From a paper:
Using the same dataset, we determined five structures of p97 in total: three SH conformations (I, II, and III), and two DH conformations (I and II). The nucleotides are well resolved in both p97 SH and DH.
Residue numbers in the entry:
A (entry chain A): 21 to 771
B (entry chain B): 137 to 771
């Protein structure tokens, strides 16, 4: 009916008193980027803020912080009417009080630390009935605006005086705490959190409206991932941010009871969550309650498993109960708990990527006060293999080193703690450096599924190869309708071949980057491990990982490794199919066409490969990648030298011109040797200057300077003497003969 | 829209059912002025005011399950009706015959194929008293409360004869004996055995059970008098999946572009529960596209608001792109769709296959009178790509038989990971679905993987072809299971296969000739919109020494060039259009709708021969030295 009615969306701008709107809605309401609006909510309560603009905002929604959201008695998905208020009134006296559960460690002064940089250069519109949150001093604290003279709302001016005296009071019985978990505390898994919201938010926010449809909801969700990836966090945050009654079941708490007290507690859990519909039951550590049937010895464990199965079947006669569970891997669960009607939906919460790890480090360092040199982006780029609990432990351990550097001014004030003393505490980059040097991550053995960062500009030349890979990978994704109309089955695999070091892994990562797909890489030793220790279920688990993360590029490096390890041209006997490429063939034949999983293999020895792979339908395209030519090597050297500070070269084109018959690895070797010579000379100069300085004490001219800041032509002219060709001309002759005898042509014009 | 253009004869005492708006609703004709019956005219007025009333105590509900809710398994449902309907509808008339009825039926299949549905529908549509036993509900009780519940179940179903006892998930109650550790589980198994023997002294009680595979049951429950009859409910075919999608979309209201036949043709590996989840998930996407007019009417729901809800084809497209089926690893037993017109030429081969496969089925009396044992196997051989799998599927289509296909990697998996019970399970699947054609592709794969002409040592029989020979020798003649093998290397095959009684007929399939390649190209190009060719016969004439795979490669490369040009034209026209904004002549047209001769003339440059002349020489020499003749007229 009215265009000011809006629905609440998430917060992006991390200021408390800032709401956001889209561009055509603000142009429809005729606002400005410095205005002051008012929001009406439930329970006859309102909130005053400052409206700004946002381009990523949707059409009929509003973006606001959790503080403003909780001050309106509003949850995600409610309705809010907005109105303009030009009544710009400056305040006179502001009387606020702290809350006792958030001040139970601090005492003395609060005005200079918390509030003095809070209102300065802010002009925050406050109102009687608001609770705001101040972070800082390794502590988050909640204040309530108790009394203002311009009732109800006023903009805080420098004319105002703030009487922060008084006793701390308790919480109102209905005011929820900002200590508990919302969507803001979760980082790095935006897609899985959005998927869980799409599954669960509609049968909870609209129970009776969904009851009258005729659509069955989901009734069991199975979260899985490595330990420490925050599954209990996600369950509790989806619980609290929807108002659903959340009951917790802990695995060892039930399995630690007696023989007859476990089933009674399960029955009490499900019967108690009946009466508070809509409810959420979270069964934590489902591996403890119901493991595999062979791992259950006894009768009590099997009675507990059968009791859980009976209750999960009894949910179908119930109404508005969602059951979530969390494991560490799928294959440790009794497979009767995975059929239809019992945990049919599965969500995978993997280890984070670099953007994810940066978001984790920004979440855990809200309250802590960093120094000026601390750059969290380099720390996030350095941590590899760390799950979120490792990053929390890293932040806490660096903060403890920063405390244990100075135990001089800390200890003498023993009875009370003032906030200025902890404001003297500031964490430096050396703290995070030592915390990186001490910590050991837990997910190093896990496989990495992430989008690559290599672009096309790291690769020199090979233009028709780029065109052919864009034809094969990208056109069935962007334009499916053309393949539907012309009636063509799209091809599914590509085999690269060529000399070693010529950039096949870089092309695979670049085409995974151009389509914004995931990338799973499988080396040669991971195939030889399956060869020696005879194990073939791992090949099925690989294609399962590839299907759960579609669209993706699955890259098999060194397919010729087993056929080379078994023998040369003549193996043990009859160099046909082996054990592992057989399972690869069966899984390729069992591949669905709708998933868009694209398989790339790579070899160096195209003649000893199994010929059953190159049959149409498995890997039919062959691409030959040659040694780079005279124009490519410049783009090779510029891509390699982009981090080392080179300077004052005469002719880099001559450097690429003189090297003929060199792969990319040889040019990388030349650049690394030049960097070696530069580091050696720049350490020798520092040692010699320090020795000559200390030999004549009290040096009169202390004028600091860097002797070798950049790499000069002497280093390259020395390092080129150690250059070598990796590929002989007989090998190039063999690849050229395979490329000639591979190609046959008619060349005759039919018309 | 119910009475409009209907002229429905109604009567006082009728209850009718109206579907629509994602809901089925039942109305009762309470009062009419032309008593008892009248045809509804446009002159009529319908007073639909009043309060809703309850149900009469004897009026059964149309919410419960009948035969209409089951799709895709018409044959198995007919077989269960033939087994069960006569001892239920006529109890005392069957009592006075002297024929024993069945007394235990075992349904099995993959999870999600609707076995509880079939049991409940056969229960309700015969009026039999239906008692349900659930496996975990009994195994979740105490030590002494399980056997009392089993005894109460059988004793209570005594008093309401005729009755049906359905034991759901029999794998939970009575597993294999080695998987039972303890004494309580063995007492439950022995109690069930004692009651199933006690049924023989009882009257008019049928016991049904449902498993997930036969081999997880204690084998004492399969002997005579205890679950002797077994019914297999497999995964559905395309007609079956279309019938499932039509059943689950009764109440939902589809849009105009939604074609369920393409959705049924696309879903492969989906059991019926996957199709129900697909329909529900697409309907939830159609709701979550518009949460604008839905939310503002919060207290009540009007049916017109859900009539604005209409599910489009993009909803089913996304639901296909998100869903993952559960029966991809299972073997597919179905009738093929390839006919004889997809294959070019080979006429005497078609005649010989019709003599071998079809004549012992259509005319058994001629083989009885003349006194001939029919042959049982055929071995095709020839160059690769010459259409052996197509001939196997075509002869399975002509006789309307099932088709089980076994590739080369499924034999090499049995070779490397040494396992031979799977060969017996294959012939069991082939006998339970007779008449069928069982096709072994690439019999030479193990003898090629073990070595060339010289293996490891002594290239005689291996491990897996040995089990194939024992199962062929153990084959009954009445079942009509027909076995076809296929090779490319006829000289390294085990000679013990070609002995009379196992695979005695040999057929050589050559490279296709000048007339066949036209029928190859027409069969390949029948989906791609080609146009305005000059001489397709010249296209088939110039290509000499080309198998079917090479011609398929030529057609696929022509389609590649066409798709590339038709994307380049759209990109270039959009760039030139956006470069000069507010384009004054917006006249839409397709640049390349059809494939022209330029694409074929470009793609023929990349053509190649797959088979050399030495290989053709070797197959011709094997065909010559295979054949010996007397050629002498005895009379
Ligand atoms: N994605 C994340 N975002 C923010 N904090 C996280 C994240 N993952 C983990 N943490 C932190 O690490 C703690 C550990 O999370 P948990 O919920 O215990 O993980 P977990 O999956 O439950 O591990 P297990 O298997 O139950 S021992 C959380 O309480 C957070 O403090
Ligand atoms: N052939 C079918 N026709 C119609 N609906 C079907 C069919 N098969 C399955 N369904 C639907 O899917 C649901 C699942 O059927 P079930 O009886 O649970 O299958 P099931 O064999 O019992 O699986 P398990 O092994 O017991 S978990 C049914 O209630 C129907 O809604
Ligand atoms: N064409 C190229 N352009 C740029 N760098 C290259 C090129 N070829 C190889 N390199 C560099 O040399 C190495 C090549 O690695 P990779 O492509 O995996 O080699 P290979 O294909 O022999 O397995 C990497 O250090 C890479 O950066
Ligand atoms: N005689 C034929 N006529 C038409 N197409 C054929 C013929 N033989 C093979 N093909 C084509 O090649 C493929 C079938 O090859 P197939 O006969 O299964 O090969 P193989 O005998 O090596 O197993 C399909 O693309 C099919 O259309
Ligand atoms: Mg946990
Ligand atoms: Mg069932």
């Amino acid at each position: 009916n009215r265009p000011n009615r809006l629905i609440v969306d998430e917060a992006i701008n991390e200021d408390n008193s800032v709401v956001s709107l889209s561009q055509p809605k603000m142009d429809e309401l005729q606002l400005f980027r410095g205005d002051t609006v008012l929001l009406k909510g439930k329970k006859r309560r309102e909130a005053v803020c400052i409206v700004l603009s946002d381009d990523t905002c949707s059409d009929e929604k509003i973006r606001m912080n959790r503080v403003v959201r909780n001050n309106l008695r509003v949850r995600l998905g409610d309705v809010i009417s907005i109105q303009p208020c030009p009544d710009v009134k400056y305040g006179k006296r502001i009387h606020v009080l702290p809350i006792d559960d958030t001040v139970e460690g601090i005492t003395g002064n609060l005005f200079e630390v918390y509030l003095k940089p809070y209102f300065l250069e802010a002009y925050r519109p406050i109102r009687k009935g608001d609770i705001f949150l101040v972070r800082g001093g390794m502590r988050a604290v909640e204040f309530k605006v108790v009394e203002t003279d311009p009732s109800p709302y006023c903009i805080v001016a420098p004319d105002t005086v703030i009487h922060c005296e008084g006793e701390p009071i308790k919480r109102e019985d209905e005011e929820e705490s900002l200590n508990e978990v919302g969507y803001d505390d979760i980082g790095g898994c935006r897609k899985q959190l959005a998927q869980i919201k799409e599954m669960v938010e509609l049968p909870l926010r609209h129970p009776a409206l969904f009851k009258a449809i005729g659509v069955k909801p989901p009734r069991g969700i199975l979260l899985y991932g490595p330990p420490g990836t925050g599954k209990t966090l996600i369950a509790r945050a989806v619980a609290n941010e929807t108002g659903a009654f959340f009951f917790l079941i802990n695995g060892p708490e039930i399995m630690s009871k007696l023989a007859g007290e476990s089933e009674s507690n399960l029955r009490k859990a499900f019967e108690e969550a009946e009466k508070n519909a809509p409810a959420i039951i979270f069964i934590d550590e489902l591996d403890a309650i119901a493991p595999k049937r062979e791992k259950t010895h006894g009768e009590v464990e099997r009675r507990i498993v059968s009791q859980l199965l009976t209750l999960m079947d009894g949910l179908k006669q119930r109404a508005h109960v969602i059951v979530m569970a969390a494991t560490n891997r799928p294959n440790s669960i009794d497979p009767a708990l995975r059929r239809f009607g019992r945990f049919d939906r599965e969500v995978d919460i993997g280890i984070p990527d670099a953007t994810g790890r940066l978001e984790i480090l920004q979440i855990h360092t809200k309250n802590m006060k960093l120094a000026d040199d601390v750059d969290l982006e380099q720390v996030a780029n350095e941590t590899h293999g760390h799950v979120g609990a490792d990053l929390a432990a890293l932040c806490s351990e660096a903060a403890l080193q920063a405390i244990r550097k100075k135990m001089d001014l800390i200890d003498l004030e023993d009875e009370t703690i003032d906030a200025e003393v902890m404001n003297s505490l500031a964490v430096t980059m050396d703290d995070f450096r030592w915390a990186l040097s001490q910590s050991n991550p837990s997910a190093l053995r896990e496989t990495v599924v992430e989008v690559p960062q290599v672009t096309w500009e790291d690769i020199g030349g090979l233009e028709d190869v780029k065109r052919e890979l864009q034809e094969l990978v990208q056109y069935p994704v962007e334009h499916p309708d053309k393949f539907l109309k012309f009636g063509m089955t799209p091809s599914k695999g590509v085999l690269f071949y060529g000399p070693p070091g010529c950039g096949k892994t870089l092309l695979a990562k670049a085409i995974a980057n151009e389509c914004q797909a995931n990338f799973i890489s499988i080396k040669g030793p991971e195939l030889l491990t399956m060869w020696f220790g005879e194990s073939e279920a791992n090949v099925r688990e690989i294609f399962d990982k590839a299907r759960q993360a579609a669209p993706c590029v699955l890259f098999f490096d060194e397919l010729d490794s087993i056929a080379k390890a078994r023998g040369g041209n003549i193996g043990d006997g009859g160099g046909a199919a082996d054990r592992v490429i057989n399972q690869i063939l069966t899984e390729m034949d069992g591949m669905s066409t709708k998933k868009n999983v694209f398989i790339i293999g790579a070899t160096n020895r195209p003649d000893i490969i199994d010929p059953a792979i190159l049959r149409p339908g498995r890997l039919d395209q062959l691409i030959y990648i040659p040694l780079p030519d005279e124009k490519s090597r410049v783009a090779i050297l510029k891509a390699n030298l982009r981090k080392s500070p080179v300077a004052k070269d005469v002719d880099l084109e001559f450097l690429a011109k003189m090297t003929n018959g060199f792969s990319g690895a040889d040019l990388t070797e030349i650049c690394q040797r030049a960097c070696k010579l530069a580091i050696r000379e720049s350490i020798e100069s520092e040692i010699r200057r320090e020795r000559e300085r200390q030999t004549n004490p009290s040096a009169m001219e202390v004028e600091e300077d860097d002797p070798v800041p950049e790499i000069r032509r002497d280093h390259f002219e020395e390092a080129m003497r150690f250059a070598r060709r990796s590929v002989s001309d007989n090998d190039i002759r063999k690849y050229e003969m395979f490329a000639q005898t591979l190609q046959q042509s008619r060349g005759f014009g039919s018309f």
